[PDB]
Design a protein around this ligand. Structure first.
Ligand SMILES: Nc1ccn([C@H]2CC[C@@H](COP(=O)(O)OP(=O)(O)OP(=O)(O)O)O2)c(=O)n1
Ligand SMILES: [Mg+2]
Ligand code: NA
Ligand code: NA
Length: 314
DNA sequence: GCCG
DNA sequence: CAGTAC
DNA sequence: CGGCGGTACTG
């Protein structure tokens, strides 16, 4: 739907975000969404005030954009913001690191390459800078998930592998590939990361590891980098989680998202004296875990109608 | 920034 | 722990 | 006045 007030607001929101004002940025995000959810182009100050997520200050900005066709605050955004955005788009660097690099006089990725001290993660993020900002066709995400599934089912064919994130939400393109792995017997998921990752390494599929606590038998996730074989391939981000079957629905719901949708659902759980995580839906406090064999049960226990993954793309 |  | 990440 | 989702690695 709408509109063009949001276009101005998003510039401001991004400026707040990269500069580290996360809660103010959150407020803008919620306002921007409320605006995008409204059917009718907002006209009245009082109208743009009745909307949940819109207050006195967001209203005024809306009124100025309606009257003047401009938001004066956009003329006074710090000159640092484009460089902060450039730096924080390095995987493994966030606002704190970006701000420090900026304070140290760095202005370009060449500055970072030649003069900044990089964490192991950040060096990987930098060397794949363009690739990690690309989205892949969902056809490619299928190939990547199948690669993971084949390696997994090769040593335990009962392993259940499901591509989640934007892929499961049906998006045409994917930022990365998110794969959930579990086992219906409730125990054969334990300790498999070593075997799975070793297998994917043997064929040269994995190219870099970002987060992978392989000294821990209770490792929950792998975040890394892969590349399919042959010409015309880019490096793609790969995220794998391995979960016990008892937590399947909550893990699936979480990993499917969207992130915004997860936050909304967890917010709602709080209002009902409950707590929702990737492990379980509980009553609040620890608390008592509720039985959730399927995603549908999570919605039901929260008093919600079920939403298909494509309807969770918030 | 928003909200209770 | 703070930072960054999902 | 003061929280905003809930959680998993890293060093
Ligand atoms: N702050 C976040 C980030 C992610 N997730 C969850 C929901 C989405 C899932 C995968 O994360 P991403 O890969 O970042 O999201 P995506 O929906 O798959 O989008 P993209 O196509 O950009 O990867 O993990 C979350 O709960 N909270
Ligand atoms: Mg994803
Ligand atoms: Na980053
Ligand atoms: Na490791």
């Amino acid at each position: 739907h709408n509109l063009h007030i949001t276009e101005k607001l998003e510039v401001l929101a991004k400026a707040y975000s990269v500069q580290g004002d996360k809660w103010r940025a959150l407020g803008y995000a919620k306002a921007i969404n409320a605006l995008k959810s409204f059917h009718k182009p907002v006209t009245s100050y009082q109208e743009a005030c009745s909307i949940p997520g819109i207050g006195k200050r967001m209203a005024e900005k809306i009124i100025e954009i309606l009257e003047s066709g401009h938001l004066r605050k956009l003329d006074h955004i710090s000159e640092s913001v484009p460089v902060l955005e450039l730096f924080s788009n390095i995987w493994g660097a966030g606002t704190k690191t970006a701000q420090m690099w900026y304070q140290q006089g760095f202005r370009s990725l060449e500055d970072i390459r030649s003069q900044a001290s990089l964490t192991t993660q950040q060096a990987i993020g930098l060397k794949h800078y363009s690739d990690f900002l690309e989205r892949m066709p969902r056809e490619e995400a299928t190939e990547i998930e199948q690669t993971v599934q084949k390696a997994a089912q090769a040593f335990n064919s009962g392993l259940l592998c499901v591509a989640c994130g934007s892929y499961r939400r049906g998006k045409a393109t994917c930022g990365d590939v998110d794969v959930l792995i579990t086992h219906p017997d409730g125990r054969s998921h334990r300790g498999i990361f070593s075997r799975l990752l070793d297998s994917l390494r043997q064929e040269g599929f994995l190219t870099d590891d970002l987060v992978s606590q392989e000294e821990n038998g209770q490792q929950q996730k792998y975040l890394g980098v892969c590349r399919l074989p042959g010409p015309g391939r880019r490096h793609r981000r790969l995220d794998i989680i391995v979960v016990p079957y008892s937590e399947f629905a909550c893990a699936l719901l979480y990993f499917t998202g969207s992130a915004h949708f997860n936050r909304s659902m967890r917010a709602l759980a709080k209002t009902k004296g409950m707590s929702l995580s990737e492990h379980a839906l509980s009553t609040a406090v620890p608390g008592r875990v509720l039985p959730t064999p399927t995603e549908k049960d999570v919605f039901r226990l929260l008093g919600l109608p079920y939403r298909e993954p494509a309807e969770r793309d918030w």
